[PDB]
């Protein structure tokens, strides 16, 4: 379990593998662009040291699953996509590892399960955005952006330590 | 002449300065035929392309460059950049890109200096006088050390060694060393290697007359 803050890559390489699977820029695509409307309440809020862990690991178990689909594979870089998977399986071991010793992850209420159905359903939402644009490549890009945006200030809790007012 | 025509117009290059945190961005651009005497300069998130957010003074400017304070503070993200290049009262073309703070952070203005001593190195790096908790940048700083040939490179904690002069002591050497000290970051990888102005200085030359 990662106790202390010494260093972190994790998150620094996610933003590297989604940004050279990237294809085209977001103003490209400034037609088939919404908002997903992701909840940031049951990930900067509340959870702040740990408690979140649980949630980010269930919540790389739907973008795994969203980009291990035939469609993502084939609309991604596979040779990108195999590292993206790597250090999904990475970021889930060093999450899971606090969940399976005996630290406080998983000592919350039902509130730890409405985080990770909050995911689901905010992934759901992506699910249909792909079906109506018929996984066209600008519906990726803002697919791909908001993962994006998501999957940074996920670990937001351990990062924004700026203002404690 | 191989692959297609070249576009000697259309350029649209972008380049981004980081001069003392603060995030100044420059657009390059060729004139083929019509000479564009302003430009407007728009960004954004990239979680959804519509808050088109115009940047003061570099709206319909004469300036090639427009400079940041507190405008882009999604460090944690890659802010769209739109360029609009009017020309008179017509737009000629406009291109985007994007840029992560997280990968990029062209650092580069920041004096920096070297003493050498007879049997050490004392670099003297002078960073902005601002305080860690003030901000909130993660990025690690990398000091080459080319010494008389051998190229090698320090990477050293930054946590409160940012916030003034960086003195970093380089040992193991002999005399007769000229070194070239470059100031660059790494961030998930380092693919970010913004080398600096390869300063070399040479400590005491123990390179005379070999006697008993």
Known sequence: ?165 | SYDSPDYTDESCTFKISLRNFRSILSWELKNHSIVPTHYTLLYTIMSKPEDLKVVKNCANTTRSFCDLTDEWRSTHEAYVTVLEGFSGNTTLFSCSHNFWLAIDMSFEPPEFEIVGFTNHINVMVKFPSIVEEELQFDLSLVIEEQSEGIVKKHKPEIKGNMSGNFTYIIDKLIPNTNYCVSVYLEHSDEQAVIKSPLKCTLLPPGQESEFS
């Not at chain 1, 792909?130 to 990726?140: D, G, R």
Request: some cysteine; hydrophobic content about 35%; proline content about 3%.
């Open chain 1, 1 to 165: 379990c990662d106790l202390p803050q010494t260093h972190s890559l994790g998150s620094r390489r996610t933003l590297m593998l989604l940004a050279q699977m990237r294809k085209i820029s977001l103003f490209s695509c400034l037609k088939d662009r919404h908002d997903f409307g992701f909840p940031q309440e049951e990930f900067g809020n509340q959870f702040q040291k740990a408690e979140t862990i649980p949630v980010l690991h269930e919540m790389i178990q739907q973008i795994f699953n969203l980009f291990s689909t035939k469609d993502s594979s084939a609309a991604w870089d596979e040779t990108l996509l195999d590292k993206f998977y790597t250090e999904l399986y990475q970021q889930l071991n060093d999450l899971e590892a606090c969940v399976i010793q005996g630290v406080g992850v998983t000592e919350t209420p039902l509130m730890k399960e409405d985080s990770i159905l909050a995911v689901r359903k905010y992934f759901q939402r992506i699910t249909l955005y792909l079906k109506e644009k018929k996984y066209s490549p600008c519906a990726w890009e803002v697919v791909r952006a908001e993962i994006m945006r998501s999957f940074s200030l996920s670990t937001n809790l351990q990062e924004s330590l700026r203002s404690k007012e």
